[PDB]
Design a binder for this molecule. Structure first.
Ligand SMILES: [Zn+2]
Ligand SMILES: [Zn+2]
Ligand SMILES: [Zn+2]
Ligand SMILES: [Zn+2]
Lengths: 73, 73
DNA sequence: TTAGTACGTGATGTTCTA
DNA sequence: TTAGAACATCACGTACTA
């Protein structure tokens, strides 16, 4: 509440169905749309925060879905 | 050997003191020269390979120093 | 309200030139 | 033989509009 559910950054309102920051809002749109497989370099449980969220699109995307984000309304 | 000591890609020669590919040669030069204080999102033990080496510069650089690479000061 | 655009920035990996 | 620069490409995050 005022904090992004994906990465803990300061949130700017709900986006695609969950409370997120602006960077996570645009990341989810880019990564949900694409037909990309993302690979985690560790164990699929990376810590996603303001400074680490860049490292692992796979875990960040997983967390977006887990927080309920969706492109299909 | 023909194998990059950092990421397992095909090596290109001895670079900065260790057998590495071309991408790891330029990465190490940029990483050692700049102090980006790279952060790992996991446990400082990421898998570094051709498909994952972009995920965790911090662990990739860790591997470079463990492999003996150095800028000669 | 929040989704879309488009920019500016920076990391990456190779080809080139020493 | 390898160091280093440059260019193209791409991921990222922001400001701005509606
Ligand atoms: Zn976020
Ligand atoms: Zn991960
Ligand atoms: Zn390598
Ligand atoms: Zn790591």
């Amino acid at each position: 509440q005022k904090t992004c559910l994906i990465c803990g950054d300061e949130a700017s309102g709900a986006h695609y169905g969950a409370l997120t920051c602006g960077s996570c809002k645009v990341f989810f749109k880019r990564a949900a749309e694409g037909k990309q497989k993302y690979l985690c370099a560790s164990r699929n449980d990376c810590t996603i925060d303001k400074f680490r969220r860049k490292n692992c699109p796979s875990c960040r995307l997983r967390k977006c879905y887990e927080a309920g984000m969706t492109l299909g309304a």
